[PDB]
Paper text:
In this study, we isolated the neutralizing monoclonal antibody CAP248-2B, and used structural biology to characterize its epitope which spanned both the gp120-gp41 and gp41-gp41 interfaces in a manner distinct from other antibodies. CAP248-2B extends the interface target to include the gp120 C terminus, effectively encircling the base of native pre-fusion trimers. CAP248-2B was predicted to be derived from the IGHV4-31 and IGHJ3 heavy and IGLV2-14 and IGLJ1 lambda chain germline genes, and displayed modest levels of affinity maturation, with 13.5% and 9.7% nucleotide mutation in the heavy and light chains respectively. CAP248-2B possessed an average length CDR-H3 of 15 amino acids, but had an unusually long CDR-L3 of 19 amino acids.
We determined two crystal structures of the unliganded CAP248-2B antigen binding fragment (Fab) to resolutions of 2.0 Å and 3.1 Å respectively. The CDR-H3 and CDR-L3 loops of the 2.0 Å resolution structure were influenced slightly by crystal packing, and a comparison of the CDR-H3 between the two structures revealed a potentially dynamic loop that flipped between two distinct conformations bent at residues Gly100D and Gly100E to flip the Asp100B and Asp100C anionic pair ~180° between CDR-L3 proximal and distal orientations. In both structures, the angle at which the CDR-L3 extended from the Fab was stabilized at its base by germline conserved hydrogen bonding interactions with CDR-L1, as well as a salt bridge formed between CDR-L3 residue Arg95I, and Asp50 in the CDR-H2. Structural analysis indicated that the CAP248-2B paratope was conformationally variable. Divergent CDR-H3 conformations that were only seen because of crystal packing may represent a level of plasticity that could have evolved to better accommodate Env sequence variation. Conversely the additional flexibility observed for CAP248-2B may contribute to its low potency.
Author numbering:
A (entry chain Q): 1 to 9, 11 to 27, 28A, 29B, 30C, 28 to 93, 95I, 95J, ...
B (entry chain P): 1 to 35, 35A, 35B, 36 to 52, 52A, 53 to 82, 82A, 82B, ...
């Protein structure tokens, strides 16, 4: 099955124009004018943005444009803005079958953001305490979320989800410290440390 | 003008049959300008065309990587079409979308997938569904559910700030937890009611928790 090749990632700053390539053969892109493009935000259904190479369906703004040259089709986004950060897929008719491209992640370049929420009265009433460390808005995607409590590295109950090739949201990450009661009232735990290529944000937040 | 509404279980046991349904509104499935497609997406991967049906086509049009395990049925009086995958394996876990594919022989949206269902996430596991316990964060996090996903809203969509919902975390017990963060005026707290609406479709559980 001869597929459609897209770059894994493309980035630009707000207001710029960017282009996404989609390379097939003469039996798909080059054989037919029935190339289309789709936008997909994380955790949401794809959305048609271009069809018949160059045409916009209803509701799609003129910042999206399509073209093709020989066996490669291109999606151009003008006036990049934060809402354009998303995955983009091309598709083509072939011989009858359809094929999607491998997908391109568009990053709009616009200090990791760390948000700490300590265990609440309702949780602790329910014999369960959870430390909520939520990080967002960092690029590139590699971040290391470590934990400490009592100035002491603790890892008994640490669950961590960071972006990977096999995740939907590549710009946010989560980490929780679940644990038995009174370990939060034992002392002024805790601190959530997050490393991001030399950018170490250790946020200490202690409930009492 | 068209809407596709998907249904079907979010949890299938291994070796059993996945059955997903797509109710079409705005065009008859017998309309010969359109093909009816199923597409799937593994976690973090790209879109994979599974196959399509065409009302006057009895031929099997399937992605050969499916290895002939998927078929389709149509309920015309319900204007509905259903994907069945037999003897499912862990590799069948994915989000499944139904979509309308306009024929190349028509101008409007010709050759493209111009309307999409909202998707159904399918987990293949022998573990049993568990509805969540939702915890208000005074003055919100959803804990100990299986399988994914959960959706969270506030005051039935009438609250939209910021808002971001963060990835779930998986515990050693095999259950998930997550949270979605929001902020509101500090003066309008003790008087206005804040209800979080958590929908865990796999357990068909909806829970509204006053905060």
């Amino acid at each position: 099955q001869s597929a459609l090749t897209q770059p894994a990632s493309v980035s630009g700053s707000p207001g710029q124009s960017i282009s996404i390539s989609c390379t097939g053969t003469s039996s798909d892109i080059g054989g037919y004018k029935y190339v289309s493009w789709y936008q997909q935000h994380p955790g949401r259904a794809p959305k048609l943005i271009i069809y018949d190479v160059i045409k916009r369906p209803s509701g799609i703004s003129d910042r999206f444009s399509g073209s093709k040259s020989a066996n490669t089709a291109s999606l151009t986004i003008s006036g990049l803005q934060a809402g354009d950060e998303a995955s983009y897929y091309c598709s083509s008719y072939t011989t009858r079958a359809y094929v999607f491209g491998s997908g391109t992640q568009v990053t709009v370049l616009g200090n990791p953001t760390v948000t700490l929420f300590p265990p609440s009265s309702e949780e602790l009433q329910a014999n369960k305490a959870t430390l909520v460390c939520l990080i967002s808005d960092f690029y590139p995607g590699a971040v290391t979320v470590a934990w400490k409590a009592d100035s002491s590295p603790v890892k008994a109950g640490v669950e961590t989800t960071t972006p990977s090739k096999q995740s939907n949201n590549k710009y946010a990450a989560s980490s929780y410290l679940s644990l038995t009661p009174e370990q939060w009232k034992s002392h002024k735990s805790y601190s959530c440390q997050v490393t991001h290529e030399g950018s170490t944000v250790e946020k200490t937040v202690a409930p009492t | 003008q068209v809407q596709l509404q998907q249904s079907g279980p979010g949890l299938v046991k291994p070796s059993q049959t996945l059955s997903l349904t797509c109710n079409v509104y705005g065009v008859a499935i017998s309309n010969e300008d359109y093909y009816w497609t199923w597409i799937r997406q593994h976690p973090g991967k790209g879109l994979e065309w599974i196959g399509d049906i065409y009302y006057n086509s009895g031929t099997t049009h399937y992605n050969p990587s499916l290895k002939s395990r998927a078929s389709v049925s149509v309920d015309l009086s319900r204007n509905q079409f259903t994907l069945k995958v037999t003897s499912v394996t862990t590799a069948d876990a994915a989000v499944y979308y139904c979509a309308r594919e306009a024929s190349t022989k028509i101008t409007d949206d010709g050759g493209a997938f111009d309307f999409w269902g909202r998707g159904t996430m399918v987990t293949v596991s022998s573990a049993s569904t568990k509805g969540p316990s939702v915890f208000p964060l005074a003055p919100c996090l959803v804990k100990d559910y299986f399988p994914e996903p959960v959706t969270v809203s506030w005051n039935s969509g009438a609250l939209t700030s910021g808002v971001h919902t963060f990835p779930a975390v998986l515990q050693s017990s095999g259950l998930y937890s997550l949270s979605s963060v929001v902020t509101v005026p500090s003066s309008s707290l003790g008087t206005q009611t804040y209800i979080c609406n958590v929908n865990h479709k796999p357990s068909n559980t909806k829970v509204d928790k006053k905060v």
